C-alpha cells in the first residue's frame, strides 16, 4: 500500500477510531496499530496454559516476540528509500516510536501481574 501522503482529515467520523489507532500521516500507524493490537490480542492464547512455569521463561518468549521484533517493521521501512512522506511516514515511526513507547506502555503484562517493577522493550525501539 502506497501513495505516502498525510492523513486525510475526514472531519470527523473515524477520528476517535484514529485515536484508538493513535495508541497526521496516511496508513502506517493507522493500519499497523490494528496489526499489532491484533497481534498481541491474538497472542493472548493463554488463560488455559496457566498453572505451571509458563509464567516463567515463556514470558521471555513473549518478549522475543515483540511488535514483531521491530526489525520486521524496521527492515522494509529501513529499506524504503523514497521521498514520498520521507520522515513523515517516519513521523508515524517517531510517532510509531511513540507507539513503541505505547508498547512498553502496553506493559500490564503477565506473571499474572508481578513484579510490576519494569516491562521495558526499547532495544528494537532504540
Amino acid at each position: 500500500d502506497d501513495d505516502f501522503m498525510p492523513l486525510s482529515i475526514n472531519d470527523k467520523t473515524l477520528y476517535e477510531k484514529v485515536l484508538k489507532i493513535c495508541w497526521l500521516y496516511p496508513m502506517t500507524c493507522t493500519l499497523a496499530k490494528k496489526t499489532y493490537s491484533k497481534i498481541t490480542a491474538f497472542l493472548s492464547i493463554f488463560y488455559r496454559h496457566e498453572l505451571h512455569t509458563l509464567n516463567n521463561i515463556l514470558v521471555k518468549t513473549m518478549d522475543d516476540i515483540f511488535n514483531d521484533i521491530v526489525n520486521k517493521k524496521i527492515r522494509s521501512k529501513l529499506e524504503s528509500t523514497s521521498r514520498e512522506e520521507i520522515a513523515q511516514i517516519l513521523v508515524n515511526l517517531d510517532y510509531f516510536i511513540i507507539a513503541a513507547k505505547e508498547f512498553s506502555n502496553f506493559m500490564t503484562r503477565e506473571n499474572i501481574l508481578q513484579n510490576p517493577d519494569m516491562e521495558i522493550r526499547l532495544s528494537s525501539i532504540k
Binding site: 508481578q114 510490576p116 519494569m118 516491562e119 521495558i120
Partner: peptide
C-alpha cells in the same frame, strides 16, 4: 539494565 524488575525464576523454584 533498567528496568530491572524481577525475579530469577530458578530462585522461585
Amino acid at each position: 539494565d533498567v528496568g530491572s524488575i524481577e525475579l530469577d525464576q530458578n530462585i522461585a523454584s
